Paper text:
The matrix protein 1 (M1) of the influenza A virus is a 252-amino acid protein, comprised of an N-terminal domain (165 amino acids; N1–165-domain) and a C-terminal domain (87 amino acids; C166–252-domain), and plays an essential role in structural integrity, replication and budding of the virus. In the mature virion, M1 stabilizes the two major viral surface glycoproteins hemagglutinin (HA) and neuraminidase (NA) by forming a matrix layer underneath the lipid bilayer of the viral envelope.
In the present study, we report a unique low-pH crystal structure of the M1 N1-165-domain of A/WSN/33 (H1N1) that shows a significant rotation (44–48°) of one of the monomers, resulting in a distinguishing dimer arrangement from previously reported low-pH M1 structures (vide infra). We have crystallized the truncated N1–165-domain of M1 using low salt and low pH (∼4.7) conditions in the space group P21 with unit-cell parameters a = 54.30, b = 37.35, c = 94.97 Å and β = 102.4°, and one dimer (monomers A and B) per asymmetric unit. Monomers A and B are related by a non-crystallographic 2-fold (perpendicular to H6) symmetry to form a dimer; placing the monomers in a face-to-face fashion that brings the two basic faces adjacent to each. Figure 1 (D and E) shows analogous electron density maps of monomers A and B that illustrate a typical disorder in monomer B. Even the N-terminal domain residues that were included in the model show significantly higher than average B-factors of 92 Å2 compared to 67 Å2 for the C-terminal domain residues 82–156; similarly, the average B-factor for the entire B-chain was 78 Å2 compared to 38 Å2 for the entire A-chain. Importantly, helices H1–H5 seem to have unwound, with H2, H3 and H5 becoming unstructured. No other M1 structure shows such an extensive disorder, although residues 69-77 are known to be weak or disordered in other M1 structures. Although the unwinding of the N-terminal domain has not led to exposure of the H1 and H4 hydrophobic residues, this observation for the first time may indicate beginning of a domain rotation that exposes these residues as proposed by Sha & Luo.
Author numbering:
A (entry chain A): 1 to 158
B (entry chain B): 2 to 16, 20 to 27, 45 to 71, 75 to 156
Write the structure that this text describes.
Amino acid sequence: HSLLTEVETYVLSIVPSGPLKAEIAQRLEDVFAGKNTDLEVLMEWLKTRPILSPLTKGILGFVFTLTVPSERGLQRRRFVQNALNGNGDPNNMDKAVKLYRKLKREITFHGAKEIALSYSAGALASCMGLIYNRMGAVTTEVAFGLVCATCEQIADSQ
Amino acid sequence: SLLTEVETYVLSIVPLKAEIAQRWLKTRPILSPLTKGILGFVFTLTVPSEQRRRFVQNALNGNGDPNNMDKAVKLYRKLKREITFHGAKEIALSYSAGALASCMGLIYNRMGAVTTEVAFGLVCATCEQIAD
């Protein structure tokens, strides 16, 4: 019943603001409906938004890179990589690698999200970083699963 | 003297250059990639008092590589139980540049994790590995 829409709800659940929620929702939905979209425009826009924590930008950046055709432009942006590089925390990095290996064996959104839902926001974000480094390591659905668990954990944290 | 070979090690990777570390202040812009993080990591050991974490935190990442991160964390644990220069450097030598670099990012965030000597070993082991 549409994973894109589920992913959007999870993404928006970590966007504080109110005005940004609407702005993010519009962009995700345009992307979903194939409407006029351009990845460089989205990223630049995302990068310059106020209020959104670096982490949220990393997550939205990852989701746009995953959902936006507009590639053939070997992406990998600084702000996305930095916000998802973990943060010098050994424990989150160790867990991120362990989750990452489990996700490579998953093939569905549901299986990926359930496994990832037990991990901490920190390791989930580091894990998103590993996958950002090579989006093909897992399937799109699995990547979506991970994004959603990450959002749940950030939302449930504070 | 330890700051001597560390200084040559620190300049073991540099691309003409102009030394900068003689033994406070700030940045250094213009060019210089990963080395920037390394150098910065160095300064953070030879410039503050008895903060920032600019491009230090970014260059000393694991570059989205699963194996480097994996290794970097296992090295990190070891370098914590280590206590001398050469020893830490010895061990760090059995790991790759990527791993070594990722290990430096960890140490950074919590410098107090490893002694200045050990960290220096990591540095040299890293540069030696890099330059090589």
